[PDB]
């Protein structure tokens, strides 16, 4: 007998807001070679890739989604990258009975089963920062939390989820402030309302503006703890920006002691996963395929999620094991792949791969603290198993964390 070709319709953002396809397309290519060379996964089938550059643009993606659906061969799965592209393809998908699997979507809105019924993602939702936040609050005994955000859909949705999570934990959100571009008024209000524990959600440019205003208002020190996303560039607060008044020394001072949460995208352990690679081996292998240096390559940090997305699908297709008879007008095979994807449980290069009821990836979070103008790993949190790995590396001026109020 001969192996039947089975096709993935993928969209890779080679440019745009998140040019993640630069490192995610080779990672997918590597993962397909690895799955296809293993006779214990899909011995009857050969997994093939048909792809287009979405440019991280929904309009551009609409042209290629057509090209994927209205040209032979029939695709069994759709693989978009960006949240905007996934929102478009995961909503449209039901009309062609297609599973949608994203390797780079962070948007909390994509975890809506009503609207995105066949959607899965190896990239976790931005809401994954919230259980780690509630756990750090509980450990440090805070029940009164202030929240400051930049006006973006992603940050609004993340704070909406944090509200429902604090309520269950017996914690309350004291004050919620927002800003589009200028954070002068929201930070002044944080001082006025005497906020101590503050969750700040913004991009890098806005983070520099927040922290300049934080210096000027003495909103840093023993009394205050800032909670930020750990996605900023190496010495972000030192980066020259002519729009800000504050100096490097003044800014290194304002950021001192702040906590960050970051989604774990590469297993820190030296263990071997289903491909039998180590996290370090995957990085070395991917670097070789790349024309440019990892620093120059978009989506290098997300590349293990793209690799793991292929294995998740390969293992799901192996459970169902037929595939060549898939048609856009039939729910039968789709519902079977769905059930197999929903029951995913395996070790990947990014760590243990499991999806929640919404189809969103469950992962570890890396907790860090800025100690002397440098981030230091203070721990890791697993939302599913409720287990916190404590490093005993955290430091406070009082010798212990402060309090949420006046005392």
């Amino acid at each position: 007998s001969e192996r039947r070709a089975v096709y993935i319709g993928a969209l890779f953002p080679m440019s745009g807001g998140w040019p993640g396809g630069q490192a995610c397309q080779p990672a997918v290519e590597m993962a397909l070679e690895d799955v296809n060379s293993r006779r214990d996964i899909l011995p009857d089938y050969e997994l093939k890739l048909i792809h287009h550059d979405s440019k991280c643009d929904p309009g551009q993606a609409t042209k290629y989604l057509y090209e994927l659906l209205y040209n032979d061969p029939i695709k069994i799965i759709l693989m978009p990258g960006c949240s905007s592209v996934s929102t478009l393809v995961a909503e449209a998908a039901r009309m062609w009975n297609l599973i949608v699997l994203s390797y780079g979507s962070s948007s909390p809105a994509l975890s809506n089963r009503q609207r995105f019924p066949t959607f899965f993602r190896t990239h976790p939702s931005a809401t994954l920062h919230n259980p780690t936040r509630v756990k750090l609050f509980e450990k440090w005994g805070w029940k009164k939390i202030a929240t400051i955000q930049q006006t973006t859909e992603v940050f609004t949705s993340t704070l909406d989820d944090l509200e429902e999570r604090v309520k269950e934990a017996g914690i309350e959100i004291t004050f919620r402030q927002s800003f589009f571009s200028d954070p002068a008024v929201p930070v002044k209000n944080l001082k006025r309302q005497d906020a101590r524990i503050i969750v700040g959600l913004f991009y890098e440019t806005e983070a520099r503006k927040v922290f300049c205003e934080v210096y000027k208002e003495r909103l840093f020190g023993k009394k205050y703890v800032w909670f930020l996303i750990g996605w900023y560039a190496d010495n972000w607060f030192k980066i020259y920006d002519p729009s800000i008044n504050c100096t490097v020394d003044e800014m290194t001072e304002a950021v001192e002691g702040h906590i960050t949460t970051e989604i774990v995208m590469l297993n820190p352990a030296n263990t071997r996963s289903i491909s039998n690679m180590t996290s370090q081996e995957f990085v070395e292998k991917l670097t070789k395929r790349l024309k440019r240096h990892p620093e120059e390559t978009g989506g290098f940090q997300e590349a293990p999620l793209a690799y793991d997305a292929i294995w998740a699908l390969a293992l799901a297709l192996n459970k169902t094991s037929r595939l060549e008879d898939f048609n856009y007008n039939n729910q039968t095979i789709t519902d079977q792949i769905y059930r197999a994807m929903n029951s995913s449980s395996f070790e990947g290069v990014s760590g243990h791969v499991v999806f929640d009821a919404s189809g969103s990836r469950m992962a570890w979070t890396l907790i860090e603290q800025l100690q002397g103008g440098s981030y230091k790993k203070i721990g890791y949190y697993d939302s599913t198993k409720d287990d916190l790995s404590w490093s005993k590396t955290d430091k406070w001026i009082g010798g212990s964390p402060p309090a949420d109020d006046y005392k």
């Binding site: 929904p58 309009g59 042209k63 057509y66 659906l69 209205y70 039901r94 009309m95």
Partner: protein, 403 residues
């Protein structure tokens, strides 16, 4: 005759509520198509409008578009897009198929972004088009200080956000900005407390009855107050919990409603040779049992915009159409430049675009005892306001003062 294919995109099914817009405009569309074919305006060719049901759904609407490109004839342009989210999806992708789109009912301000939607045009003024009209009304009555009352829903916050830029560099102060999600009472009390006299309201029909209930309780009505609110509500909308009906009508008395003008009031012959009044009779006879739609005139003028655009494009090609696959970038640019030249008198008044946006007419109404009565119109082209003499009225000897 060779066909000039046009992709008609709209909800048409009775199962979908917005299907009434698509069905309500088809007799008007039939009328313009019939005349253009009789007059042989597009000779040697003929206008071939193919209809595809979007069902007012993002997935169904996208598949309807995809199925039209795949199985349908080769369309030269898109006619339609009614529901805002479906229209945004199609409008953003247009360049991929070099298709120019003309909508007659999508009023979402979002679509005015030509960086995101360069191939999109609309004959209907957007929800923001009421703002340069309101500025003219404020200037006319010497209202230099205003308060705002907005429902925390995208449809309304878009309008309020636009008002900021319209009133900037103008001698008008927004002394109080108030928002609400479910109950306006707290926001209405704050407006009263800050002594707001002229209120610019942006909220739905359901919230409007709550707004006027709070207004009665806080005495924010009569000779001293002027409410300027949406003019698109259903007639007898207030009839449909704490306040009485008589107390609601007392607070509602004198409110100014603002919305686009469905048809021109000018008894002047249009591009078709008929006055707007003559077209309206023709539309009412043709519609039969199908319920009327306020977008009918915009759909009628829409067909004329396409016919005139195709004419100009045919001249441009002859100055130097059948094999237009969706690959011909040049023809798409020709159609795009031809549509930008649109300038004729239609049933909705003068049909002209400013960066894909309609420069049209805005209707002003006033609630008088039992219903909304027309009190004026704003011409966006000329940026002029005409207030109908012996219609608009104030409870006091003078219109209210702003402080």
């Amino acid at each position: 005759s060779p066909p000039l294919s046009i992709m008609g995109l709209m909800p048409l099914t009775k199962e979908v509520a917005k299907g009434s817009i698509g069905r309500g405009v088809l007799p008007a569309v039939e009328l313009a198509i019939e005349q253009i074919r009789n007059e042989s305006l597009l000779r040697p060719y003929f206008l071939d409008l193919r209809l595809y049901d979007t069902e007012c759904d993002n997935a169904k609407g996208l598949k309807a578009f995809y199925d039209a490109i795949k199985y349908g004839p080769n369309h030269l342009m898109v006619f339609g897009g009614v529901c805002p989210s479906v229209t945004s999806i199609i409008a953003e992708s247009l360049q991929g198929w070099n298709l120019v789109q003309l909508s007659f009912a999508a009023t979402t301000p979002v679509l005015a972004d030509k960086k995101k939607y360069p191939y999109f045009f609309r004959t209907v003024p957007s929800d923001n088009a009421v703002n340069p009209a309101i500025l003219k009304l404020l200037k006319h009555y010497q209202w230099k200080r205003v308060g705002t009352l907005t429902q925390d829903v995208q449809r309304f916050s878009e309008v309020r956000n636009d008002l900021t830029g319209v009133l900037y560099g103008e001698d008008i102060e927004i002394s109080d900005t108030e928002s609400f999600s479910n109950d306006p009472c707290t926001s209405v009390k704050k407006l009263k407390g800050n002594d707001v006299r002229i209120i610019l309201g942006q909220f739905d029909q359901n919230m409007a009855a709550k707004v006027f209930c709070c207004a009665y309780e806080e005495n924010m009505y009569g000779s001293k107050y002027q409410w300027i609110i949406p003019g698109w509500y259903e007639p007898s909308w207030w009839e449909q919990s704490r306040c009485l009906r008589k107390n609601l009508l007392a607070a509602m008395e004198g409110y100014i409603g603002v919305d686009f003008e469905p048809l021109s009031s000018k008894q002047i012959k249009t591009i078709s040779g008929k006055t707007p009044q003559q077209y309206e009779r023709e539309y009412n006879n043709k519609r039969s049992g199908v319920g009327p739609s306020k977008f009918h005139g915009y759909a009628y003028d829409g067909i004329w915009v396409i016919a005139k655009t195709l004419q100009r494009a045919m001249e441009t090609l002859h100055a130097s159409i059948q094999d237009f696959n969706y690959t011909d970038h040049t023809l798409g640019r020709i159609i795009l430049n031809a549509m930008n030249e649109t300038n004729f008198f239609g049933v909705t008044g003068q049909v002209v675009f400013r960066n894909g946006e309609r420069m049209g007419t805005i209707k002003f109404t006033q609630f008088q005892d039992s219903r909304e009565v027309k009190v004026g119109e704003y011409n966006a082209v000329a940026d002029t306001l005409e207030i109908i003499n012996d219609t608009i009225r104030f409870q006091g000897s003078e219109p209210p003062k702003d402080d």
